[PDB]
Amino acid sequence: MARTVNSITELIGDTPAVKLNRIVDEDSADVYLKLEFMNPGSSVKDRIALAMIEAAEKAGKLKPGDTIVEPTSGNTGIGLAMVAAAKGYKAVLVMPDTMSLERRNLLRAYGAELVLTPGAQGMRGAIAKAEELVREHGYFMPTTGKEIVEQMGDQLDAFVAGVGTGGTITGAGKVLREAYPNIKIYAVEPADDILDTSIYDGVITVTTEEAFAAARRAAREEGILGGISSGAAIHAALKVAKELGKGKKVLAIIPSNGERYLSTPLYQFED
């Protein structure tokens, strides 16, 4: 059970699922939280970062020590910086200039080179700058479901995940529906020629207030400390769980750890 590997990237994935025992009413289905912050980069985005780079390698678009440019932000940026370092690639991350000095310290610690774009232009601005760098320098610019089946075994009634996890949802769903034909999949979002409906059955909207409440509660009562998007998923999972009722099972994705959001109002206290 104690494992030995050749690279930290091999640690990405196979995240554990923890059954909730206190914040769930006696009437609800059982709720399980898959902790993606258990990834080496501490977020579900370690997965997409690894996948992006492995696709580039498989496609012969990358050779040892090559430079890769990528317009990115948030947890995906951290994931790419870590993966690039472990793989030996030189990462040039084009990111909206909205992060703190310490975040830049983190990214640079992995050897990533940062190119900061206008904060007000968001990703569009980053994307534009990256395409610019490519034309000037010629830089190269480029499992969750399986794990869930293994962990949930023969039964899973509902799957819940934030829209911030994007393709993770999209990809895990194909596996889940095949293992659990009757499963319902819900995409969770901030309150703020046949159609394919396979990605999700319904959208669940959660207010920042509801999100804060759920994350604070799970942290206090279960010792599970997630970020804001995590509180939203928890609230959604509890909601769905109440409708399903006893004997049923719900699993939700916890994308990141609260330790990365201590400067936000999430765990802000009076003093």
Active site residue 198: no
- Residues 6+ away with beta carbon under 8 Å from 47: 12, 13, 36, 39, 79, 143, 144, 168
- The C-alpha atoms of residue 93 and residue 69 are separated, in whole angstroms, by 6
Name the catalytic one among 34, 45, 184, 239: 45
Q: CA 56, 162, 19, 239: dihedral to nearest 10 degrees?
A: -160
CA 96 – CA 129 distance, rounded (Å) = 10
The reply to whether 167 sits in an annotated binding site is yes
* Active-site annotation holder among 28, 229, 230, 256: 229
The encoded tokens of residue 127 equal 């994307």
Instruction: Establish whether 208 is an annotated binding residue.
Output: no
Element at 20 (helix H, strand E): none
245 known ligand binder: no
Q: Is 41 annotated in some ligand binding site?
A: no
Let me know if 229 is a catalytic residue. yes
Binding-site annotation, residues for pyridoxal 5'-phosphate: 75, 164-168, 229
Tell me which residues are annotated as active site. 45, 229
Binding-site annotation, residues: 75, 164-168, 229
